[PDB]
Symmetry: C3
Subunit: 406 residues, 3 copies
């Protein structure tokens, strides 16, 4: 029988029970609380390790497969769908957080473009560029944190060059095609340890909860994120699928249910990629030619739920700080949330790593992310589920939009 979904479901329920029991029956110091989540920490180390080779190989392989000029229309449709759906998600999140009200910008805007074109490839693999005004000259320095956005841009450009280069670049096509397969196999190996890591990751989160009052304080913020993700994944995505594809969207989701369930459990759109491939290709009978580009590329660029979560969380933290947001502040939040979703990886907690960028877009303190850390696991799992669902609908939508080409 299948072991992944079950093992992970058992891990999640065991994590809930372990967290509850340990938090109440026992009293652990900060030390023991940190040491109790060590297996989950090691899982994060392994997943963050696979980020860089996975992204580089996936982007290069995906865009190099679409070598033909006619095949490039498939890529054009995919990128416009990714941007359009992510923009819709950001708009929906901002509107909802403004309505419910649960609670140096140019430097960050230019830092987005600066990080889109890193000065060094090797440095971009593990470092990012940030500029700050001072006396008013601009001083920019590199800080830790993989430059996922710059790596993505170079990988897409490099893969396009390799595909157009023809047989001269066939060695590089094969090199990166094998490197993507090998990285996916390593992710599958990580899947063996994932259940235990997820157990101690979920349990570790519950232990850090102090007196259950923080969930009440963040309940309205949780409601805003959850309602936004729900609307996006149950109305907007099915609706757009119906307009482009004259087929039942909910049947499409039911055919891709195992992938969404796995995403909602492991909270990784890249680790669930094999499941996403299998579901779309087998149950939905989607063409392999468009899937092999839409799914792996969209697993990293197309992150709609993360974009919605970034927008809602940034506005909510601002509202907590009692900083009234103007039109330009809303616009800059929208752009940085779109960039943050693009620049965030498909790993658990990737949402929090790029959250500081959107927070600093409006001058908010970097450490203000701690205001929503406590309830991040539940929101992270859901935003990932919808993240994969966005790509899931894109596969069928791109297939319909490219029927003649295939």
């Amino acid at each position: 029988n299948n072991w992944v979904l079950l093992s992970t479901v058992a891990a999640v329920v065991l994590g809930i029970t372990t967290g509850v029991l340990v938090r109440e029956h026992s009293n652990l110091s900060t030390l023991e609380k940190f040491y109790f989540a060590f297996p989950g920490e090691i899982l994060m180390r392994m997943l963050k390790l696979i980020i860089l080779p996975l992204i580089i190989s996936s982007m290069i392989t995906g865009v190099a497969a679409l070598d033909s000029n006619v095949s490039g229309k498939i890529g054009l449709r995919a990128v416009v769908y990714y941007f359009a759906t992510t923009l819709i998600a950001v708009i929906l999140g901002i509107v909802l957080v403004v309505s419910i009200k649960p609670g140096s910008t140019v430097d960050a805007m230019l830092d987005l473009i600066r990080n889109m074109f890193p000065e060094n490839l090797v440095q971009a693999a593990f470092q990012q560029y940030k500029t700050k005004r001072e006396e008013y000259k601009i001083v920019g320095m590199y800080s830790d944190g993989i430059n996922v956005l710059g790596l993505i841009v170079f990988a897409l450009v490099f893969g396009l060059v390799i595909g157009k280069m023809g047989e001269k670049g066939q060695i590089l096509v094969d090199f990166f095609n094998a490197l993507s397969d090998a990285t996916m196999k390593i992710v599958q190996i990580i899947m063996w340890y994932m259940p235990l890591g997820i157990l101690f990751l979920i349990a570790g989160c519950i232990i850090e909860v102090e007196d259950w009052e923080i969930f009440r304080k963040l309940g309205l913020y949780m409601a805003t994120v959850l309602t936004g993700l729900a609307i996006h994944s149950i109305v907007i995505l099915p609706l757009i699928y119906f307009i482009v594809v004259r087929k039942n969207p909910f049947r499409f989701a039911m055919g891709m249910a195992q992938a969404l369930l796995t995403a909602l459990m492991i909270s990784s759109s890249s680790a669930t990629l094999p499941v996403t491939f299998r579901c779309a290709e087998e149950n939905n009978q989607v063409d392999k030619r468009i899937t092999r580009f839409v799914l792996p590329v969209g697993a990293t660029i197309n992150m709609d739920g993360t974009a919605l979560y970034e927008a809602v969380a940034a506005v909510f933290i601002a509202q907590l700080n009692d900083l009234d947001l103007g039109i330009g502040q809303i616009i800059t939040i929208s752009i940085t949330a779109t960039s943050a979703s693009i620049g965030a990886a498909g790993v658990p907690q990737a949402g929090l790593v790029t959250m500081v960028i959107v927070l600093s877009a409006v001058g908010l303190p970097a450490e203000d992310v701690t205001l929503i850390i406590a309830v991040d696991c539940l929101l992270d799992r859901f935003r990932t589920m919808v993240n994969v669902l966005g790509d899931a609908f894109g596969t069928g939508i791109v297939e319909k939009l490219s029927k003649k080409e295939l």
Copy 2:
């Protein structure tokens, strides 16, 4: 019709007009002055990004093509020509700057050798090694700045090993041959954006000029650099070509005019490399076998005008500081200027990145480079033009010196 040369010439003239008009009619603060050069800044980020893959692939591919022992004579002639002509340029620059007078060394000497053999390959991709006396033990630490010299040495050694390794290393030959072609294609893609970047780079430089008095103060220094570059490119280089090649050198230059013009506009010996290839192969009917090694390798090692500029500028800054230079100080300046030209990339402003090394050779402050920043663009464009011209003459000279081998 051709678009590059024209587009870039229009960009340069538009930059002059934009700079003049903006500097006089309008008054911009330091902030707006920095933000006005942002498109040029992004061009620098893209060009600096391509530095590392371009150099690594170019060196490995160039020296791996000359696999045969007989073919290794071609490489030997090329390297001796590069060193000899660069040494002549340094001597000419030092003599001129001493005559006109426009105005811890062992640690730097040993740091050259230390950086020739970096401790880490990945660190050398983005960091450099420097040692300083203190209490007198020596303390060495790594600092930011790509170790271009160490990467060059490893790439040459690695490429030699790959070429001699025969069919066992053929996969690596092909891998790096495709990687060089792909990097050149990415540079060609950058050429699309270059015109706008050059416009805002030239315009941005003029804005930073305060009251036009700095050009008068540096006029004699500009004259020394310009006369030195002129002499080197119109007397020494044509003369040596005549001794080795019994042909008209100025006709050779007229056949390679489009490459020199493009270099004088874009200020990059590596970005103009496709033009240099086309001119030498088509107009001058130079053999492709020797061109494919002399041009790409010489685009990074053989930088004669930069060597002349480094020597003249280092001595000129010293003269400004009223530090009387001894014989040993002149000798150490010559060696570090040769190393700096070798270690500087083929990008706009590469001359200034390695200038700190030669300045610190004589104990001068690192921030003293600011004394010649204002007039750097004009000198940078000319020194690049002669840089490409040095390689241009080397192609024909190496062909003549290897007539029997071909």
Copy 3:
């Protein structure tokens, strides 16, 4: 005739004579003492440069050759032998140092596992992770020092994936097979300069000796390390070879004498790898299929003398500090010494780079390594000789244990 062994023997004796004469007849300041060892320093820079490509290619190539499931038994036998013999060495060293008595642990224990799975591949190439308690939250930061252990784990996992991936990963097999051959050729090129570097490395060590009193102070510690290494290489290793292989072990050592002699001279188990290959394959008629995996992999993981030296030196420094070691302290020293031997490279002085980890396991100051630096060269040469001998016996032992498979 052969030049390596002789040239290096002449270099060692010339280093002894140069060190003695320079130390006594002349009086050199700290400056001149440091500058006198510069050629040896450059040798260290070159060898440390080759560490990373050598290890990565060696591990991947070694474990990818054993693609077959039946062939994986060979790898299983090799790894269990490496661990078992290293554990025996650590136990022997601890017992001897406790008997003779020549003189935050959980954080280091968890740091071993954290570094086994680095967060970034590129960062692991040149940086390591360390955590420290403070106010008690845990704060972890990355520091300089190549993460050899994390690179080894990823390389082994990656190579296993590539081997199992079949013909899809054949391009990567060939890429890393050529990269290993090229790296070995570069090491052979370094062998040309090694004699001079070893001369100034040995001479430089003798100069730093102050008044010959430090050797007397560390004489008992030197005796403990030397007796432990002797016992391990003349009793334990020959005995275990006899149990598994019903052949004369000392004849096996006499057949591999040139490799042990070269190791005792150059103090590098990786630079002597070509000699180890030649001796085992020619004189001992060992099968090439098992040698090509046991030797290159064991040159980096299987370091028994280093493990013994790490344990003895850590306990000896602790004894100097008058810190009474409990059972748990001994156990944590044993584990960290095993990890340190695994994580240390096959270069001269690799023992000292990972010594700080085992020292900090028991809270000892990092700079306490200076207490045994003076006499490190002699101990380093011997521990390397036995390091290669451990792998030497493993080749024959693994061959006997896999007779049916071959």
